[PDB]
Design an enzyme around this catalytic site. Structure first.
Site, PDB file in Angstrom:
ATOM      1  N   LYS A  75       0.752  -1.272   0.000  1.00  0.00           N
ATOM      2  CA  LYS A  75       0.000   0.000   0.000  1.00  0.00           C
ATOM      3  C   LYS A  75       0.775   1.310   0.000  1.00  0.00           C
ATOM      4  CE  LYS A  75      -2.834  -1.238   3.994  1.00  0.00           C
ATOM      5  NZ  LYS A  75      -4.314  -1.186   4.267  1.00  0.00           N
ATOM      6  N   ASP A 111     -10.080   2.689   4.020  1.00  0.00           N
ATOM      7  CA  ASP A 111      -9.972   2.191   5.381  1.00  0.00           C
ATOM      8  C   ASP A 111     -10.498   3.241   6.355  1.00  0.00           C
ATOM      9  OD1 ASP A 111      -8.748  -0.336   4.759  1.00  0.00           O
ATOM     10  OD2 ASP A 111      -6.855   0.726   4.416  1.00  0.00           O
TER      11      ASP A 111
END
Ligand SMILES: NC(=O)c1ccc[n+](C2O[C@H](COP(=O)([O-])OP(=O)(O)OC[C@H]3O[C@@H](n4cnc5c(N)ncnc54)[C@H](OP(=O)(O)O)[C@@H]3O)[C@@H](O)[C@H]2O)c1
Ligand SMILES: NC(=O)c1ccc[n+]([C@@H]2O[C@H](COP(=O)([O-])OP(=O)(O)OC[C@H]3O[C@@H](n4cnc5c(N)ncnc54)[C@H](OP(=O)(O)O)[C@@H]3O)[C@@H](O)[C@H]2O)c1
Ligand SMILES: [Zn+2]
Ligand SMILES: [Zn+2]
Lengths: 287, 287
Positions: A75, A111
């Site tokens: 990520k 998220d």
């Protein structure tokens, strides 16, 4: 309709990239949501080695892969291969969702929103409130950057240095008062006036489930809301401790599902059915 | 098992690369066979522009895609991006099947073999016969090279010299006599004494199923065998033209299946069920 994806020559591909990924619940979750909404997409998992990350974006573009979910350990590194990056993503400094359209690969990070929806969808809009975030890793970071936009957050952690550093980055980037709107502290901080506590640590997570909670019963109250990002097992030792005081408990299932729900929207332009996702995942956890 | 494909985080991906690929029946053929055998793979189609073909193999290697089938118009341009190419595909000069193994991409060509199996299952061994092949594309190449190994062939094409070129090349590589064993001509070659004719051209293929057959029933004969590589429609004009002379007809179903069956084995080490592949296609073609 039928179980399993009805694939044909026009089916579009979306995948999870990371290393490892063979245990992700993502495929299961998204394929059920695709069927339900009758969308012709399939979700698969791609185990990508770090040295090969440089070849995925151009491969996806060449292939016509519509998007990806990104997880450990890509990520942070995938960002240098994308054409654009969403602000909310640039803030947290990590991408977990990608959409490829018109030769342009855009990075996103859901998220943050996920952990919010996990809450609101269960207790309504969350603004101007006292929220304590236990932990300072990737989870606590995404959560904090989102809940700090309109809330007073206190990042408590085992290693304070880490807590201090995160609180400063948030106050700075989001322009808030350090020692006031965005605070930091050890795991000792008291919950007097604290509306919500969120556990962003692995304490209580399998296989070390029989350990004592991040906070004893003494500091727990009913007027509070205790959400635990862990989801293995769903009801942790932290939620038990909070049940013996009628507190509004929320398990990790919320963030996991909603985090995906937003990505789904980004890829398909349509909102997925939350219960389908849950029933598909919750059924995978239990027998 | 389930009606559709039950994908999980371990499902391996095999794709078809080409342009266009939306009307391919290969995904149907292979997923049906994967399921019948309990194999955890999914077959999908990727629309790849000629300009992006160069990013696919590294992309595949990066993502863990285990194999591909290659169709128009990449059967030749893909060869330069592969690591190894087996004998046949190298002689034939075209690749229709790829397998990624040990970080290595390997090219194969199952077209030729596929055509012989489909022809031989229908009329027994094909050896020491006069065969005319209409066309000079990747298919014509594969089938011509394969049957030229033990039969007298004649390559007939609208672009004569293009057919002359192919004839010389075949005679060269197979140690055949350019003048007799391997000949060439235009689309009006005389068929007297010719045992079998094969249509390796798009003439008559969906959606333009009303055009003029590549050869009038005038030259056809009852004791002749006519195979059309087209499988959609299941009965082209050429085949119903052949039927009006009681000639033995064969459509492209067999080549499609046998060609896939060999590729299937290559990717998985397992032999697929022919009836499964066959019926899965027929059902998607007909009602
Ligand atoms: N439900 C969802 O959507 C979702 C999403 C992402 C993650 N999760 C998960 O979220 C939780 C958090 O982890 P993460 O992967 O994001 O980051 P991480 O890299 O695992 O973060 C580590 C955190 O754990 C702390 N910690 C670890 N062991 C501890 C202990 N024994 N005592 C006190 N503190 C301890 C660290 O304090 P130090 O830095 O000082 O060690 C730090 O705050 C995990 O339990 C995982 O299951 C759920
Ligand atoms: N059933 C199976 O297992 C299987 C496997 C592979 C391919 N197929 C297919 O096999 C057939 C052949 O093509 P290909 O992909 O191998 O190669 P290709 O690259 O399409 O080759 C082009 C061929 O088409 C000819 N042609 C095209 N339109 C024509 C027309 N209107 N009139 C006269 N000639 C014409 C060309 O003669 P020129 O070069 O001179 O134009 C040449 O022979 C196609 O119909 C395709 O659907 C079936
Ligand atoms: Zn590893
Ligand atoms: Zn079509």
């Amino acid at each position: 309709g039928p179980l399993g994806s009805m694939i044909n020559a026009k089916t579009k591909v979306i995948g999870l990239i990371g290393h490892p990924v063979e245990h992700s619940f993502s495929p299961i979750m998204h394929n059920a949501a695709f069927k339900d909404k009758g969308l012709n997409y399939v979700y698969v998992a791609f185990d990508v080695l770090p040295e090969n990350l440089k070849y995925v974006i151009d491969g996806a573009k060449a292939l016509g892969i519509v998007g990806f979910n990104v997880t450990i350990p890509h990520k942070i590194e995938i960002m240098k291969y994308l054409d654009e990056i969403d602000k909310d993503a640039q803030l947290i400094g990590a991408v977990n969702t990608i959409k490829i359209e018109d030769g342009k690969a855009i990075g996103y990070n859901t998220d943050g929103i996920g952990a919010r929806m996990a809450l609101e969808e269960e207790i309504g809009r969350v603004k101007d409130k006292n929220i304590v975030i236990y932990g300072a890793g990737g989870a606590a970071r995404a959560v904090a950057f989102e809940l700090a936009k309109d809330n007073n957050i206190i990042i408590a952690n085992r290693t304070v240095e880490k807590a201090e550093a995160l609180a400063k980055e948030i106050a700075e980037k989001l322009n808030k008062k350090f020692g006031e709107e965005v605070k930091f502290s050890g795991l000792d901080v008291d919950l007097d006036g604290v509306d919500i506590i969120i556990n962003a640590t692995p304490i209580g997570m399998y296989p070390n489930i029989d350990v004592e909670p991040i906070v004893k019963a003494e500091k727990l109250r009913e007027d509070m809301v205790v959400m635990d990002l862990i989801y293995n097992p769903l009801e942790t030792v932290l939620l038990k401790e909070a049940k013996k005081v009628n507190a509004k408990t929320i398990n990790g299932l919320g963030m996991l599902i909603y985090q995906g729900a937003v990505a789904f929207k980004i890829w398909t332009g349509v909102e997925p059915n939350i219960e389908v996702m849950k029933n598909a995942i919750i059924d995978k956890i239990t027998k």
